[PDB]
Enzyme design. Structure first.
Site: not given
Ligand SMILES: [Mg+2]
Ligand SMILES: [Zn+2]
Ligand SMILES: [Zn+2]
Ligand SMILES: [Zn+2]
Lengths: 65, 34, 56, 53, 45, 49, 56, 49, 279, 49, 56, 53
Positions: H2-5
């Protein structure tokens, strides 16, 4: 920069195929989408590896040692 | 008769550079990526 | 304020020289023990003072 | 030496392992995305023939 | 003394301290350093 | 009575094999040397793609 | 860190490899995401600054 | 992720995906001062240095 | 006063102590008990990371000029107030020496190390009864030759004489004292290659001469009265061993040498041609 | 078990950027201090704060 | 501004962050490698002396 | 190794080369042999010479 051994995603051994593939491409005038299917690379995970490899090692070998 | 006055840094592959006309097989000899 | 500021103190007569720590030297490679600017300006002050003392 | 894949992918004796059950979607274990008709847009599996529709 | 190798002439050199940094057979001024002899261990991981 | 050392250590966080070492002289005939060290970076958790 | 929620006190959990991991909800106050943002950690060195953290 | 992981695949990392080489090169050079004090390339001991 | 600090573990005390500096912790520790002796170590590379006393000593300096925010009725007086104390300092003759020799060695196309030794070799002697003037050239003409040879680059007297005309005599007396100035304060090989390049020859012709000249030197043949000459004959010896047109007349003016010393020097060579056979 | 959604799925060129994490992790308790001001030095490379 | 109102400090760490849907809202995951470095000076009392003895 | 590949590069390719391991139970995990790190009871040794001629 040379012929990966096994396909990354898949594990299938692929590094015994580069010469057979180049030759298939070159002496029998197949297209890749057919050269590849003849080497048995059916999953597009494995097709990626050979189809897209860049054989840079030839250019390295030019530098006389 | 002619006088030294100083040295001009050369741009690579320019008319005055050793590489300007070199050939590929020669570029490898000089160890320069073609 | 006649205890803490006479107007006649805005004219420098003596000069306070900060100790080394305010202007430390960079003792580098046994001869590049470089010196802080405040040492220089102080030298350059002290010279320009030393001279003018003679010139009278 | 002797080892297992769980420790490095080199000690692994298997390449891709196919796996599939219920090729008609009888169990409704998946719901098919579609635009007009699901049955057209999702190609039948090979196995879809070893079980009657 | 220790082995060296010309950069271009490519000849083993074996000069010492306070010898010229200079290649026989071509007064080329670049020398490599003749890789170690002790074995070195890698993991195929 | 002799000498204070001025050697160059590898970085406090690096490792890997010396790759090649070459020895020459600068313009002014002063010896000087260039060491190259080689590492393999394997993708890790905080790496940016 | 332009508001007081950009510095909150957390509890350590020691984990393997080298990133700080934080819950996802806490991410909007810090205004962080995980494209390489880095965040800083400060350890309190006393028994009483500890309680300042845990309680405020 | 999530959140660009993102989740990467550990097996594909083992087989080479995105490995890379790193080459850091160090230079050093010995200076002369007055032909009086002159740095030197040598291996020192804790006894003389 | 003695103003001196030494560290020693007051709970081992065994030695002039066995302590180590843990830099990355800013500590020094008794290598035996690990008591930390002193901390808050101060950095040692970051200091000069942000960045000549052997010459400029203790009387310091600072280049004073004009900023953006000054009109010429203040700028030029900074050029008219700086000029009042240039004679209390002999340092004009100190710096203008360096500036001159810097102007020299640099115009001479020399390695910037020689520049220093001459910036030294001036500064070390810099006033002696032996010096007592003597044209202030010969030193800057010899302190260079000093600074040159002392920096392991040897050049002929004529070569510097080209740079500075020293009457060839004011040079000689000035050199002797100068060398002995440092001896109290306390190599013609260099000519073979610089000559070959002056003729634009490949390395082997120069390569060989080092053997030949050394071998011609090693056995006999004192041969030469300033061996500058008997250097070149090795080239002439070896150039004729090759077959490249460097005809005697071309040699001479290119290297500014007598032709007579060549052939007669080559007499001892057309006869000694025995032992120079490497291949 | 079958996932109840279906996954968009196929190859895509990805590049590995320069920012490895190991070049960024950094900690400090009581390292060295600047000279002029005597606060901790700056910079991961020199064990900064 | 740069040395009194704010300054660099000891007992801190900085690294890249990641998410974790398995930490509580208030935990933070700290790499073992960092936790080995940062440090907290505890006082030996009757209530922990043996436990602290173990650590040493 | 004077080839144009780095050692750990080559060493990594060797790891992925699939070796015959039909009779692998007759080997032992190299942390169960008591050898000074490896012996024929726990490992197999190969070698590779190549020269460009
Ligand atoms: Mg971001
Ligand atoms: Zn595959
Ligand atoms: Zn002690
Ligand atoms: Zn064994």
């Amino acid at each position: 920069m040379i012929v990966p051994v096994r396909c990354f995603s898949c594990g299938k051994v692929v590094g015994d195929k580069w010469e057979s593939y180049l030759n298939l491409l070159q002496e029998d005038e197949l297209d890749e989408g057919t050269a590849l299917s003849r080497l048995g690379l059916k999953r597009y995970c494995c097709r990626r590896m050979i189809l897209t490899h860049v054989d840079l090692i030839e250019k390295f070998l030019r530098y006389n040692p | 008769g002619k006088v030294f006055i100083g040295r001009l840094p050369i741009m690579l592959r320019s008319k005055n550079c050793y590489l300007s006309e070199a050939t590929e097989s020669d570029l490898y000899k000089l160890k320069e990526c073609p | 304020n006649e205890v803490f500021s006479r107007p006649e103190w805005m004219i420098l007569t003596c000069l306070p020289v900060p100790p080394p720590p305010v202007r430390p030297s960079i003792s580098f490679n046994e001869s590049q023990r470089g010196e802080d600017d405040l040492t220089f300006k102080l030298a350059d002050i002290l010279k320009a003072n030393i001279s003018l003392e003679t010139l009278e | 030496k002797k080892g297992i894949a769980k420790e490095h992918a080199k000690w692994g004796p298997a390449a891709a392992i196919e796996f599939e059950y219920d090729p008609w979607n009888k169990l409704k274990h998946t719901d098919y995305w579609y635009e007009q008709d699901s049955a057209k847009e999702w190609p039948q599996s090979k196995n879809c023939e070893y079980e009657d529709p | 003394t220790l082995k060296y190798i010309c950069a271009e002439c490519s000849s083993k050199l074996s000069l010492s301290r306070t010898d010229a940094v200079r290649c026989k057979d071509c007064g080329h001024r670049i020398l490599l350093k003749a890789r170690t002899k002790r074995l070195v261990q890698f993991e195929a991981r | 009575h002799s000498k204070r050392d001025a050697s160059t250590p590898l970085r406090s966080t690096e490792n890997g094999i010396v790759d090649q070492v070459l020895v020459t002289t600068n313009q002014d005939g002063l010896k000087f040397v260039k060491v190259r060290v080689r590492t393999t970076k394997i993708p890790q958790i905080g790496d940016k793609f | 860190s332009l508001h007081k929620m950009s510095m909150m006190a957390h509890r350590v959990k020691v984990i393997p490899y080298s990133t700080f991991r934080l819950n996802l909800s806490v991410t909007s106050p810090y205004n962080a995401d995980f494209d390489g943002d880095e965040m800083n950690l400060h350890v309190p060195q006393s028994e009483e600054t500890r309680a300042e953290l845990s309680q405020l | 992720n999530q959140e660009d992981s993102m989740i990467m695949n550990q097996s594909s990392i083992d087989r080479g995906l995105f490995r890379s080489l790193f080459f850091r090169s160090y230079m050093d050079q010995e200076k002369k001062y007055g032909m009086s004090i002159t740095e030197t390339f040598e291996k020192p001991q804790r006894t003389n240095t | 006063p003695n103003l001196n600090i030494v560290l020693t573990c007051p709970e081992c005390k065994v030695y002039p102590p066995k302590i180590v500096e843990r830099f990355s912790e800013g500590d020094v520790v008794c290598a035996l008990c690990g008591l930390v002796l002193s901390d808050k170590l101060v950095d040692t590379r970051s200091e000069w990371r942000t960045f000549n006393p052997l010459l400029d000593g203790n009387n310091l300096s600072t280049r004073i000029g004009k900023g953006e925010t000054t009109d010429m009725r203040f700028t030029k007086e900074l050029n008219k107030a700086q000029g009042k104390n240039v004679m209390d300092k002999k340092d004009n003759e100190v710096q203008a020496a360096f500036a001159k020799i810097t102007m020299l060695c640099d115009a001479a196309e020399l390695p910037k190390i020689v520049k220093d030794c001459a910036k030294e070799a001036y500064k070390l002697c810099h006033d002696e009864k032996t010096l007592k003037g003597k044209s202030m050239e010969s030193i800057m003409a010899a302190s260079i030759l000093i600074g040159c040879r002392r920096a392991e680059v040897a050049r002929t007297f004529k070569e510097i004489q080209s740079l500075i005309h020293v009457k060839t005599k004011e040079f000689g007396k000035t050199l002797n004292i100068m060398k002995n100035i440092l001896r109290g304060k306390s190599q013609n090989l260099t000519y073979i290659p610089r000559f070959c390049s002056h003729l634009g020859l490949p390395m082997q012709v120069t390569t060989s001469a080092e053997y030949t000249a050394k071998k011609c030197k090693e056995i006999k043949e004192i041969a030469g009265k300033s061996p500058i000459t008997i250097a070149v004959v090795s080239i002439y010896l070896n150039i004729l061993l090759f077959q490249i047109p460097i005809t005697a007349a071309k040699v001479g003016q290119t290297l500014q040498v007598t032709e007579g010393t060549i052939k007669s020097g080559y007499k001892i060579l057309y006869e000694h041609r025995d032992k120079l056979v490497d291949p | 078990k079958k996932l109840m959604a279906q996954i968009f799925f196929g190859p895509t060129y990805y590049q590995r950027l320069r920012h490895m994490v190991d070049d960024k992790i950094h900690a400090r308790a009581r390292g060295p201090m600047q000279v002029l001001t005597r606060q901790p030095v700056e910079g991961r490379s020199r064990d900064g704060g | 501004r740069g040395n009194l109102m704010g300054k660099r400090v000891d007992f801190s760490a900085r690294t890249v962050i990641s998410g974790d849907p398995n930490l509580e809202l208030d935990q933070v995951g700290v790499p073992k490698s960092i936790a080995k470095t940062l440090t907290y000076p505890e006082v030996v009392t009757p209530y922990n002396i043996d436990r602290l003895t173990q650590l040493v | 190794n004077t080839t144009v590949l780095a050692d750990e590069f080559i060493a990594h390719r060797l790891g992925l080369i699939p070796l015959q391991s039909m009779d692998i139970e007759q080997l032992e995990y190299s942390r169960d042999c008591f050898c000074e790190d490896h012996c024929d009871k726990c490992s197999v040794v190969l070698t590779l010479q190549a020269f460009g001629e």
